[PDB]
Amino acid sequence: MESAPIVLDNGTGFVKVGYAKDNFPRFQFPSIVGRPILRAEEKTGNVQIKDVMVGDEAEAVRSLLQVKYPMENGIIRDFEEMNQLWDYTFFEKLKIDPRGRKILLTEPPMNPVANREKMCETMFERYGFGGVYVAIQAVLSLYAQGLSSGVVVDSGDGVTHIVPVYESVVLNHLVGRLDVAGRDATRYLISLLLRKGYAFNRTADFETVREMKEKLCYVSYDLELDHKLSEETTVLMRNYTLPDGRVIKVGSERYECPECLFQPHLVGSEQPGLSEFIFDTIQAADVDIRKYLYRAIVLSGGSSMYAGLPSRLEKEIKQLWFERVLHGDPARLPNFKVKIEDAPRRRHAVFIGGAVLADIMAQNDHMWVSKAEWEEYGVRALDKLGP
């Protein structure tokens, strides 16, 4: 294929993988590992299950598997299962020998140091990569825009994180985590459907409500209007057929599920939701740069894909500036400019930006942490990878 640097978005819900200059993931698959189970469920001779089965091999066959996730909240929870994802990623998805290759990895901005350390150790000491770079996921989503300033908010399966950038300087003191994302919204959909008498407690059923959420949920633009369509009308009602063949009815849960991003208290969090987390972040930036951050609020990651989320977010920031800056005086509201950037490709902006950055540093061999540098400095070799 090519001698290029490999780029790997080892995300909490999905792995995405490919090479420098790729305009889209070469492969993308669930970051899941499966073990064989029997469960008072259908069985046939038309398949065979190995003692470890992962990614697409697990997701297509998950009725037969104990499904587990090697990651949660942007951190590796189990490196023994993460080793099985990385084996699968290199040896039977890419079908590559890692020996002496250079690889670009990704993580969110406020992880434990042990996550990056043991992840780089694994690249040098299981796979024998010749060099590694680890990039902050949301600065890659800005490389995908071809853009040097704006506040970039990335919401995936594990974490929602925000990174203000101005004139290519990253405002590291302003970066933050909202510990609500696509998995919390999926756990909330299970909780809301449980009030309707449905049950989804099997490890294989989490991917079923993920696909249901991803098909049927949307962000209410106006809560009292969606509550009116919900309580006065049947128009929000929708049928979903599970891979069982069972049919379930879903109504208010379609707007009530993703509302936990804009109202985290619905999932028990005390943090402010997306609009107020983004506003408190921009409003903490210096006076001379606030306008440039409001004129480029860059959305990223799969949990930014709910229908109406850009519309609600733009409105709710105008509405929050009107409360907290103008104190309810209409006369200056038309002068406040905000622009949500909401590209079609934005679920993959971290990969697409990693494929840009990995090309920009492909020839600059000193930019990567080397295997020869790792084996003499250990974890102190990673002090190259920013502050």
Partner: protein, 400 residues
Amino acid sequence: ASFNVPIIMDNGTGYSKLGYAGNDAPSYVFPTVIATRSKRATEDLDFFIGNDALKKASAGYSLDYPIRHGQIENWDHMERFWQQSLFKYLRCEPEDHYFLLTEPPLNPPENRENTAEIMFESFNCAGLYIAVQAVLALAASWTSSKVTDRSLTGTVVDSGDGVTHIIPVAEGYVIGSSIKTMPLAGRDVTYFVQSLLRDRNEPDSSLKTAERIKEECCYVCPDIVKEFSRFDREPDRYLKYASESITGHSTTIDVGFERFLAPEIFFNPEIASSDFLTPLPELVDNVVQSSPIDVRKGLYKNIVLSGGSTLFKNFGNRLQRDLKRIVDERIHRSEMLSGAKSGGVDVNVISHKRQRNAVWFGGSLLAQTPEFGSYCHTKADYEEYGASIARRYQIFGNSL
């Protein structure tokens, strides 16, 4: 509000407990069952309820339980059950009295709406409080009504006939994000006892005989492979139960491993169900570990038991030891990383003299409060807004 005593109705899946605020017991405790017929039309007058419905199966009435898995699902039958509760048993006029009702924490907005229109339009009650049921069961746990005896923080495990739910409450506030429910309770352990009598082809496997074998013969063991082995090692572990048939003759039933294997439904729900898998000690851990960090000692220090299906011999001791194992293994993982011993946490599971009817006794104690009539919907609220007044969830966080 009126100066007349509030009327307390805990309508469970198995049993309805009916009475007046401030009494030392419910006035009635009888099954939540209706017996119905299956030139003027009067077949909606001809029904019976409770103990008097159980007497009517031989007279050709069809019995039904209008509450199943904690939720009302037949509003015709629940309206007739309430009118007969009010006018036969409680012998009261709704226009003179305020009512305390109950339902599970999950229960649909639709159920509280349907409940309010029957109470305010069919019966025309003066006012209605629909209580969060296991929050009342915390208040029944006090040693006396005096403020110095109150323990406003505790986990409550309620297990009745139809559903079991674990509720964290702290400083008197319900942490609704942390509610856990297991869809299995006292009826599913009866269907399991019944299924085991039926697998042995015993002379009787009627539902009353499987029920009576739970109440009298069943208990919670430490471990079912050790207890199966004890039923080889010791011979008087098998009991003989004498039962009388529907057509009025004697029978004798050998009762065996269902004595320990049937209460194991709570500690291994993979025995009961394909659809629920997490055992009750792990499910109580998930309630306290999802709950805010400053209330976790208080929630483990006071795990109140509630509802009839928590009364199995050795149940609270199995829950306490298995949860203490989960809790200390999690604390020791942290001591072994840090190189310093903790203070630990005491896990206390609390069984108490009012445990059988803790929701009703709590409802009685809370309806005695001077403020109570201000927490009710009054019929004057219902005349303005209708049944929509009761629709909003009390226990969970609402959008809007």
